[PDB]
């Protein structure tokens, strides 16, 4: 997350923090997640493409801090991981960058709601906000593209949706971008998502309820002019979701 500000997990209670064990007991933050159902988290498949083994990932809800434990947070294993069949990335762009994780705690419980722990509203077929609308993104991603550490407290920041006709442009990302994808940047490019923010939520206020209209997927820079972020547009995966999502 470039620009932005630090938040507590409460401003963003649907966020999920995904860790991978390197073995030894060694864990590292991999990707962000959004909790869409009390037993289901959704992310990007690139986050796990190289190490698909499920018995190997860890999800934390209600976690606002990275290596200190928040109060109220719950820990889960991964009952199942499902990457999108037609996931491709022979190029800058990812395609179909969408993954689901089935979580369950050591006590067998799925996710219990609270002020820390909330689900996120999926969009609906035709409810994508206007271009120029202001959604928020959040995560532990780096705070400068040339940086070594990850910020230890969660961040958030607000970007404005960009029309697909606009970032299909030469100066932008030309043919690299499809209509199953959704661009979004600051208008003076002062703030964006960065490495680490992958798999986290693009959230918009829709008819009141907070909603998950995008997933952090890819972009060229971290907040360069004419080089926005890019998101999996969740409306175009509602069947795939639905299909896989039930189980």
């Amino acid at each position, epitope marked *: 997350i470039i620009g932005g500000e630090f938040t507590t997990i409460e401003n963003q209670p649907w966020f999920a923090a995904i860790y991978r064990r390197h073995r030894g007991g060694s864990v590292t933050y991999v990707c962000g997640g959004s909790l869409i159902s009390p037993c289901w988290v959704i992310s990007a498949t690139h986050c796990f493409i190289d190490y698909p083994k499920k018995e190997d990932y860890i999800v934390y809800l209600g976690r606002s801090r990275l290596n200190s434990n928040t109060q109220g947070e719950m820990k889960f294993e991964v009952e199942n991981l499902i990457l999108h069949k037609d996931y491709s990335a*022979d190029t800058l762009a990812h395609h179909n960058d969408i993954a689901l994780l089935k979580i369950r705690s050591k006590e067998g419980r799925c996710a219990q709601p609270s002020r820390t722990i909330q689900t996120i509203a999926l969009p609906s077929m035709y409810n994508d906000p206007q271009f120029g609308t202001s959604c928020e993104i959040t995560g532990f991603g780096k705070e400068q593209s*040339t940086d070594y550490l990850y910020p230890e407290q969660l961040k958030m920041t607000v970007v404005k949706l960009i029309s697909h006709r606009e970032c299909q442009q030469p100066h932008y990302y*030309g043919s690299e971008v*499809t209509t199953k994808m959704l661009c979004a940047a600051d208008p003076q490019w002062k703030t964006d998502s960065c490495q680490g923010d*992958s798999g986290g939520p693009l959230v918009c206020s829709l008819q009141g309820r907070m909603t998950l209209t995008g997933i952090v997927s*890819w*972009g*060229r820079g971290c907040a360069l002019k004419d080089k926005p972020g890019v998101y999996t547009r969740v409306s175009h995966f509602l069947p795939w979701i639905r299909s896989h999502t039930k189980e």
Partner: antibody
Amino acid sequence: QLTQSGGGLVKPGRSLRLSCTASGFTFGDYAMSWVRQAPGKGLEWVGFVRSESAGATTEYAASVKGRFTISRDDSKSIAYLQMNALKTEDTAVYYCIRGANWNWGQGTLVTVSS
Amino acid sequence: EIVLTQSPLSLPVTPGEPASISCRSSQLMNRNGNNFLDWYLQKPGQSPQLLIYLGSNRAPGVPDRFSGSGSGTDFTLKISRVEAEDVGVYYCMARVEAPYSFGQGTKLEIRT
């Protein structure tokens, strides 16, 4: 993995279609790249076709965007680089590439000569 | 679009000594850390083979003596210790976006 057929001698201004038959992997899951060399000098990248899952759009290089086009046929699992108005400066050994970069072929020298 | 100049163009080495070529560009990162610069070697014969992909990941089967490194605009390939078989031209390549492009090449000449 990638046998390059087609090619040879052609007169300037004339055309030609280099094909490339693939095996051992799923052809539909990959972009297909093409890179030239031209005897004595280094590599120029020339174009690609996207996976199809990604829209099978094509990018080209500055030199060739006018003349060259580059196709695919998931069915027969081939990629094809059709070169149209052919310039003598187009003489090179042309490799099929698979992916961005994964597995080059052996290429086929095209020589454009009277 | 992106122009790479690699240095040096020829480079003589005694097998068992380490070599180091360096590609200098002007662009290049994505949002997951990876720089989109690859290293090939064309062995005498023909047909380039990919050595390092994505800046620092060694392609499969590529021996352990090769190493991807760099950041920003300055990337460099490294052989801990040359071998007879490593003779060739090395090409670095930029594939962040838009049109792709190569360097001019580096000719590693290697003996009693």
